[PDB]
Amino acid sequence: GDWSFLGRLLENAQEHSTVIGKVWLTVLFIFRILVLGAAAEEVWGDEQSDFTCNTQQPGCENVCYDRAFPISHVRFWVLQIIFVSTPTLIYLGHVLLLRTYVFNIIFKTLFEVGFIAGQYFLYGFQLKPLYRCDRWPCPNTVDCFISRPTEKTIFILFMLAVACVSLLLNVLEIYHL
Amino acid sequence: GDWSFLGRLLENAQEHSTVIGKVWLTVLFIFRILVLGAAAEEVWGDEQSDFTCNTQQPGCENVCYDRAFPISHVRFWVLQIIFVSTPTLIYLGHVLLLRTYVFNIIFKTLFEVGFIAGQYFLYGFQLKPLYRCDRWPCPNTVDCFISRPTEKTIFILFMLAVACVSLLLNVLEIYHL
Amino acid sequence: GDWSFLGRLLENAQEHSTVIGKVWLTVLFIFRILVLGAAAEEVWGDEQSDFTCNTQQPGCENVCYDRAFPISHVRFWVLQIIFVSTPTLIYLGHVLLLRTYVFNIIFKTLFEVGFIAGQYFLYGFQLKPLYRCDRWPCPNTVDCFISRPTEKTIFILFMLAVACVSLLLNVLEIYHL
Amino acid sequence: GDWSFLGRLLENAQEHSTVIGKVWLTVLFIFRILVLGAAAEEVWGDEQSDFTCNTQQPGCENVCYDRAFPISHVRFWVLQIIFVSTPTLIYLGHVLLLRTYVFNIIFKTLFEVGFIAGQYFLYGFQLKPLYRCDRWPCPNTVDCFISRPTEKTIFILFMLAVACVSLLLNVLEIYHL
Amino acid sequence: GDWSFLGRLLENAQEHSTVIGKVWLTVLFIFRILVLGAAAEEVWGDEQSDFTCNTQQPGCENVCYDRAFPISHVRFWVLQIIFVSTPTLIYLGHVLLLRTYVFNIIFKTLFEVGFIAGQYFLYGFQLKPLYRCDRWPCPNTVDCFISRPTEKTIFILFMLAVACVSLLLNVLEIYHL
Amino acid sequence: GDWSFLGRLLENAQEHSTVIGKVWLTVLFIFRILVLGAAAEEVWGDEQSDFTCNTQQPGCENVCYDRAFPISHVRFWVLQIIFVSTPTLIYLGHVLLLRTYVFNIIFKTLFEVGFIAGQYFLYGFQLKPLYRCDRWPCPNTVDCFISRPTEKTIFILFMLAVACVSLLLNVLEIYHL
Amino acid sequence: GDWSFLGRLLENAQEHSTVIGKVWLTVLFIFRILVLGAAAEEVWGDEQSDFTCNTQQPGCENVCYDRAFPISHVRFWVLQIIFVSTPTLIYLGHVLLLRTYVFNIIFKTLFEVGFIAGQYFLYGFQLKPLYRCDRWPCPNTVDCFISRPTEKTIFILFMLAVACVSLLLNVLEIYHL
Amino acid sequence: GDWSFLGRLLENAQEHSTVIGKVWLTVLFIFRILVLGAAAEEVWGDEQSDFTCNTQQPGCENVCYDRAFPISHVRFWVLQIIFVSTPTLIYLGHVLLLRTYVFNIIFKTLFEVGFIAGQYFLYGFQLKPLYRCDRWPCPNTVDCFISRPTEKTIFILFMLAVACVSLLLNVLEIYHL
Amino acid sequence: GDWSFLGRLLENAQEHSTVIGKVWLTVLFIFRILVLGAAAEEVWGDEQSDFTCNTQQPGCENVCYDRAFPISHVRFWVLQIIFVSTPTLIYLGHVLLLRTYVFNIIFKTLFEVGFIAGQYFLYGFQLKPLYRCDRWPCPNTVDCFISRPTEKTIFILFMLAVACVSLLLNVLEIYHL
Amino acid sequence: GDWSFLGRLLENAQEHSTVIGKVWLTVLFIFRILVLGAAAEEVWGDEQSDFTCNTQQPGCENVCYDRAFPISHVRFWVLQIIFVSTPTLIYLGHVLLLRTYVFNIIFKTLFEVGFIAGQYFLYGFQLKPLYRCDRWPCPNTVDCFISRPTEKTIFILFMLAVACVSLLLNVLEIYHL
Amino acid sequence: GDWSFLGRLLENAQEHSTVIGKVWLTVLFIFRILVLGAAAEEVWGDEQSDFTCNTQQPGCENVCYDRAFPISHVRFWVLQIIFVSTPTLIYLGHVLLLRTYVFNIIFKTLFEVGFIAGQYFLYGFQLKPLYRCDRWPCPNTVDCFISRPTEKTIFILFMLAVACVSLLLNVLEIYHL
């Protein structure tokens, strides 16, 4: 995607961050951003198309999709990356400051905890193929099947593990300080 | 998209802008432009395709879409970004000037207020799935369903909050001066 | 894809790696990454679309695909590349250390052995066109045909040979030390 | 495609290669790579889609395609380029050596002869529109028609002529030495 | 497309070319390459898809397309650009030589005359919508309609005029020498 | 249809009925029954089939038909014939009786008045092609078109005129007595 | 059809009719009724089905048929037969009377003249295949094609000639009296 | 239908039955049999065809029909007529006997009570358009719509009233004896 | 069909016709009428339906059928039977007369010769499956295939032989007189 | 159907048969033949049409039907009636003879036992909706659903009970002799 | 069908035929004609419709049917009945003559032998479901499947056995004379 500017600004920030923060940033680019842009977009690219329901109702497919995936995992991870990476750029701007750094890392930690919690609240780290929806255009509990459930589940687990690792890194960093 | 030149010119302008203006610019790139190019274009990419109406009239779908979304949110946000970012480049050109800066920020504020007002006037920060249209090819109040209503609503709210934050930043800046 | 940052960091690492490690890195870019991005994505791009089953059940296609390819070979190779390339960046970060280098190469070796083993466990280096699935929406052992089986098999063999060559390179390097 | 890194490394190698080798490299980029990336990918992009067979058997199309084109010409040319260009990078790495250069050029010559021979063995420099296939899902010698046969034939001839020219260049170079 | 390397090499060559040759090169990039990459690829992108014939024969569409457009105008113009631009790079390589320059310009002139002549021989600077084909799968002179005939005709005329202008430039240059 | 037995019994009754009653009976067979069996059944035979609504709702057609024609004109006329002809057979059975005959004719008159009144109440002697229905499966006032409206209207008028003539005959008969 | 009773009553009437009237009655049964029941019903049986219009409007076919054939020729001929044959049964009833017979034949003559005149007024003894209709559901002068136009025209001519012959017979009879 | 033989045998029986029994028999032919053969068979002729369910399951329509109408009303009424009319022919055979006649009428009464009771048990004298079925091929309570519900309801009521009248006739007859 | 009345009248005529005329009449009923009503109507019943042309033009099928079969063989044979059988009824009416009989048989002979000649003129005693039509809606010589060509040819030959036999019978009869 | 001649011959035979044989014959006409012609033909009329299988194989439906119902119940019952009724006509012909009558009744008994046994052997007095077939065109045990299974089962039971009653009648008759 | 007249004439002939000839005639009506009219026409009624081939060629179905069944078994049996029954009517006409009777029976025998021989020559008393046809519109040996093969085979065997029995009857009769 249009990730170049963020990468440039964070390369600028890397010269100011600590060792473990640098490790976190390389985890972000190599794992969070790269897997999201290179693999996932090809996976979730057929999310609306190949979501085939079991009715002749014309509108049931759109609505039952929106009831299944109110916000796709790709968009959610994108916003997670942005909201978790902004504090780094705040700190860099402050440089261009210990308590500032501390507030930066707690912002990261709290937002990322919020994101994993929200992801669990929406989709409990598993996409089942079947979804039974009862929205109005859909009559009487339509069965609707999802595309690439196993693959999507795998990438959810992988990215959730990456986020847990980022939390571990920040929780190690805060004690290292 | 073809955002590179604007980014270069605004990197040139960043060396001349204040602290809070720099914060505003990073808000613009990290939030306004990035989320618009990376996430939204994948969301609104299936706006015309998966807009399935409930008739056999051939032309009802095209017309009812145009009656629902006269101008998609993506194009509207693009024009919002451009019209809000041009004053920065005007000011930079003037540099290459206090009252100039002041007129710059009021231009930003007024245009952005206009854009949030227009967005509310068209789509009241919520895309409902159902739209009932009565254009001529559509006979007798056709029901037409929209793709990704919840996700689109979420991104509308997110970008509207970003714009409100930009207004807060400019209104803080004008008093800071 | 969005491979530029990894390439930059590994160009930085190339100045610190040995001769045989440099050979391994050029094998990675010229063969692993390039063939994956230039050829394979065009091959596996029609994996879900042209996977035509032999039933009128609406959901049988999605489910039988997911039962055939839980995770596509492209995503698997991407993760293989990432997990095999991260130790190089760890070592570079340590530079910016002999035992560190040794642990780096055994990490590469063990992960890559794990990946070839997993690939064999899932798909035994051959995609047959026919897959007979018995998932619930599919009634009574549906026949489902795959797109580009021979080509996909060829690229599996090619990439598996590349990975075996990387293992040979690392096993030559460890004795060269 | 993701050709930038190869181009950079070969620009590095150009300062070390002879005149005729430099001519060969410019032939590679201007003709082999550029025509493959700019024109051919648009040609062979509709290879699986518009390959319309003459049956109602659902699986006959996939299988008969795979029996016609086990590996598409685009992928084959990509691998040809890689396997023919790797010796240049080997030689550059050795520089960073006359017999090395000689072994480099014979590697190029032998691999490229192998590739033109394999291409002739698979597709005898002509794509006919009709292919009659008798694979199992296809009953009784189905007729299947190919998309862009004449154009594909033309590009096969053009690239085969380019490869013959590369062989002529190397065979002139080896005597020039 | 993947035009960057050619552009770089020709920027290198621009410092050595004359005034009128520089004008020719800017004509090439601004008109030949840019219009071909930015506009035409969007025009001819729906060449095979929306070519709707008037039969139920499954194979008639593929064959009648190939009989209409053996080689699309986009590919033809690409090869025209390459074959016309190679002499410039030959001359640059010779620099890194008056008779060399003269042979360069006559190569350009002769190849470009050949290309306009071939284009006239295939498609007489006008795409008519209707094409009546009598290939074997098509029974008894099928009518087949083409997509964007007027637009394609316009771009043919524009590019043919650009090529005529390049011939005028070279014929002015040769007398200027 | 299976009209033979009624015809036989009424041939038996004809020997006992008066002149004007015999005229009425021949009006019944020649006009009421014959036109109903020979022409109308061919007209209303395509009543449910070619009743094409303007929606993709699957159930809207069945329901909107039933809301348009709760009971088809053919069945209604059949029951009219039966209910109007039974008194003749009652009278014949009484023979095998002046006041009996009088009660017979008033039964005919009253039932036939009831039938023309009911026909007017349901379908006001005119089938318009368009019917706008709002039953539950039909969303928002579907337009539904009817087959053979003009012809059906003509036959309604013809049979209604026949019934009016039967009323005139009975009202002449009662005074003739 | 259900013609048996009319035939029986007219067999009763044949013993009372003259020679030329008997000829007329045999013309009626052998030509009018038999050809109508044996051939025509098979011809006009596909009148609504195979009337294929040239639009995607769902309702245009029903309406344009009704605008073409307000009342099919078969129903019209049936009513012609009935209205022309009733006077014979009136006369028979009067028997069970010269001026009565005369009024009978003028009734026949006048009604039959009315029927041929009406048939000419509706369909000028020729069914053309094409009908261009502009009813409301049909947009902008739809072309609609008719089934069996030539055959239907032939049977129209044949039955019209039969009716003209009946008029000649009655006009000969009235002078024979 | 093939009702002629029953009618002949019952005409033979009519000479032996009483007045009220003769009335019952004429009620049977004029109302039970005639309406069943002339009107109902045209009504229920589109029972399986135009029973359109709201799913893409192929088998749901057949099964849900069978679950709605295990035995159609037409077949049920046919068997009712047969089982109610057989005692008359038994009695006639006995003639060719007062207690025999009495047992005959109680057989009629009891069987007809059984038939109206069974009809109520299956279909409570009303066909609703909607039927919600949950048979195995039908997933999750499919909605299925019925053809001619109102008309079928009307004919059910009419025939049920006829049967009640037959019961009244027999209950009057038994006291008349 | 509705052949009963003709059969009755000709049974009346059989008592007056000679031996060979009686043979002719039994040939007519057993062969001409019976095979036409029992077999042929089942053959030609799918004449318009299964006449599948090779175009997407909607109207080409109707028109090309009418151009192939202006009048179907069944209708033609029906009219042949009528026009050939009327003289028998004329003669019977004259009875209820040698020169009358002679004129009767020459009428039969001449009309039947006319009918076989017309049949040859239209369809030369052979229905080929393929018909190539060029009517206006059909573009450029559409191929259209016929249903049951061989069977229809056989029945044409059989009925033509029957007619030739009738001519032989009449030509034997005229000399027998 | 064409049952009239059999009925006439058996009416002739009724004057010669005993009381219980006459009862059997009336059971045959009222129950066996009438229910078969009036109800069953309407039931089994949609046997091949609405037999919807669950595959896209074109030929699987025809073959799986033939594997389910090698001979439909209607044809089987027709042949049962014929083979059981022929002995009556044999006996009548012998009349126009006690041991002859005895052989007649044992023929009836044995053939009817054979028919009920064969019916049980084919379809065990119950049509289940689902049939799983594995014929060659059908791949891997297709599910195929039947139309009107419950109704068909009911009529099987009814006719089987009628046949058992005929056996009881004959077994009572043989002892009565 | 329209069998009544033949039946009447053969009832007239029955009074003149011998015992065994009468048996033959009752075999004809009860078995040949009745089974042909009551059962077979329902079987072969779906011969052209449900003959589903395995191609997208539009014309292949019509042609391959005609190549499979040049003349359906029903028409063939009808003609067999007629050609075998005509001698009986010839003999009756001669009555209204021993050598005449003898020539009659040899005509029957020879024609019926010819018919069974022709039936064997066309369809060897077995309809297989699969037919592989290579007519021109059908490309490359299409597979085409037949409807009701087993049932049709059974009725072929039954009618062939009936014909063999007729031959046995005539061969017994000729010796009985």
- The answer to whether the CB atoms of G61 and F52 lie below 8 A apart is yes
Can you give the length of chain G in residues?
177
What number of other Cβ atoms are within 10 A of residue J51's Cβ? 20
Method: cryo-EM
Reference F37, options F68, F81, F5, F70; nearest CA is F81
- Would you list which residues of chain D are within 8 Å, Cβ to Cβ, of chain K? 54-57, 132, 139-143
Q: Are A92 and A13 in contact (CB under 8 A)?
A: yes
Q: Which of B54, B139, B140 lies nearest to residue F57, judging by beta carbons?
A: B54
Question: What tokens does H5 get?
Answer: 């033989």
Please give the residue of chain J at the shortest CA–CA distance from H82: J30
Q: Specify whether the CB–CB gap between G127 and G152 falls below 8 A.
A: yes
Alpha helices in F30-97 (DSSP H): 34-35, 41-43, 60-68, 73-95
Say how many domains are in chain K: 1
At C45, the amino acid letter reads: G
| E131/E134 Cα distance (integer angstroms) | 10
List the end-to-end C-alpha distance of chain H, in Å, as a whole number: 35
Q: Which chains touch A (3 or more CB pairs under 8 A)?
A: B, C, F, H
G and I adjacent (3 or more CB pairs under 8 angstroms): yes
Q: Answer whether K touches J (≥3 Cβ pairs < 8 Å).
A: yes
Helix axes A149-176, A19-27, angle to 10 degrees: 170
Phi first, then psi: give them for residue E128, nearest 5 degrees. Answer: -80, 145
Partners of residue K37 in chain J, C-beta under 8 Å: 1-2
Element spanning E21, H or E: helix E19-27
Q: Which of G4, G11, G18 is nearest to G170 (CA)?
A: G18
Cβ within 8 Å, pair H141-A142? no
Minimal CA–CA distance to A48: which of A78, A75, A30? Answer: A75
Backbone φ/ψ region at H71: left (φ over 0), alpha (ψ -120 to 50), beta: beta
Pick from D56, D61, D18, D22: nearest CA to D147: D61
Which residue is listed with tokens 């794992």? A31
Give dist(CA J136, CA J141) in Å, integer: 10
DSSP state of G53: B
DSSP conformation letters of F132-177: EE--SSS-SSEEEE-SSHHHHHHHHHHHHHHHHHHHHHHHHHHHH-
Residues of J in contact with K53 (CB under 8 A): 58
One DSSP character per residue, H36-93 reads: IIIIIHHHGGGTTTS--BS---SSHHHHHHHHH-SS-HHHHHHHHHHHHHHHHHHHHH
CA distance D152 to chain E (A): 9
Chains G and C, touching by 3 or more CB pairs within 8 angstroms: no
Q: Dihedrals φ, ψ of I98, to 5°?
A: -65, -50
User: Among all chains, which residue has been given the structure tokens 């609505």?
Assistant: A63
Which DSSP helix (H) or strand (E) runs through B108? Answer: helix B98-122
Q: How far is C170 from chain A (nearest CA, A)?
A: 22
Beta strands per DSSP E along I6-157: 130-133, 142-145
Please, are residues C76 and A33 in contact by the beta-carbon 8 Å criterion? no
Count the residues in chain B. Answer: 177
Phi-psi sector, E141: left (phi>0), alpha (psi -120 to 50), beta: left
Q: Between chains, do H143 and A139 touch, taking CB under 8 Å as contact?
A: yes
Rounded-to-integer distance, Cα E90 and Cα D23, Å:
8
* CA distances (Å), origin E97, targets E111, F2, J84, K60: 21, 109, 113, 70
How far is residue H41's CA from residue H74's CA, in Å, rounded to a whole number? 7
Q: Shortest CA distance to I43 belongs to which of I2, I66, I77, I67?
A: I77
> For residue B59, how many other CB atoms are within 10 A of its CB?
14
Contacts of G56 in chain B (CB under 8 A): 56, 58
In chain E, the residue whose alpha carbon lies closest to the alpha carbon of K57 is E57
Report yes or no: J85 and J28 within 8 Å, Cβ to Cβ. Answer: yes
Closest chain C C-alpha to A98 CA, distance in angstroms: 23
Compute the half-sphere exposure of residue I48: CA atoms within 13 Å on the CB side of its CA: 24
Cross-chain CB nearest to D56 (options K54, K132, K141): K54
Domain that holds residue H149: 1-177
Tokens of H25: 């028999």
Which residues on chain H are in Cβ contact (under 8 Å) with F5? 7, 29, 34
Return the ∠ at Cα G23 (arms to G18 and G28), rounded to 5°.
Answer: 120
Identify all chain K residues contacting J84, using CB atoms and an 8 Å cutoff. Answer: none
Distance CA J165, CA J172 (A): 10
Element (H, E) at C133: strand C130-133
Would strands E142-145 and E130-133 be described as parallel, antiparallel, or unpaired?
A: antiparallel
For J131, phi and psi rounded to 5 degrees? Answer: -135, 125
Looking at chain H, which residue has its C-alpha nearest residue F45?
H42
* Separation between Cα atoms, residue I158 and residue I161, nearest integer Å: 5
Task: Give CA separation, A34 vs A41, A76, C90, in Å.
Answer: 10, 15, 17
Residues of C in CB contact (< 8 Å) with A are 1-6, 9, 41, 45, 48-49, 58-59, 61-63, 65-66, 69-72, 74-75, 78-79, 82, 85-86, 89, 93, 137
Closest residue in E to I140 (Cα) is E141
Nearest-angstrom CA–CA distance, D104 and K116:
83
For chain A, what is the radius of gyration of the CA atoms?
19
Cβ contacts of residue D53 below 8 Å, gap of 6+?
D60, D61, D64, D138, D142, D143, D144, D145, E58
Buried b (16+ CB within 10 A) or exposed e, H130-145: ebebebebbbeebbbb
- What resolution does the deposited structure have, in angstroms? 3.4
Between CA K99 and CA K104 the distance in angstroms is 8
Q: Distance between CA atoms of C5 and C33, rounded to whole angstroms?
A: 13
Q: Look up tokens 């504090």; give the residue.
A: A87
Give the number of other Cβ atoms within 10 Å of residue D66's Cβ: 24
Reported for G154-159, long-range contacts at CB under 8 A and 24+ positions apart, including other chains, are G154/I70, G154/I71, G155/G35, G155/G39, G155/G40, G155/G43, G155/G73, G155/I75, G156/G73, G156/G119, G156/G123, G156/G125, G156/G126, G156/G127, G157/G125, G158/G35, G158/I79, G159/G32, G159/G35, G159/G36, G159/G73, G159/G77
Separation of alpha carbons C95 and C87, rounded Å: 12
Nearest alpha carbon to residue D113 among D167, D149, D157: D167
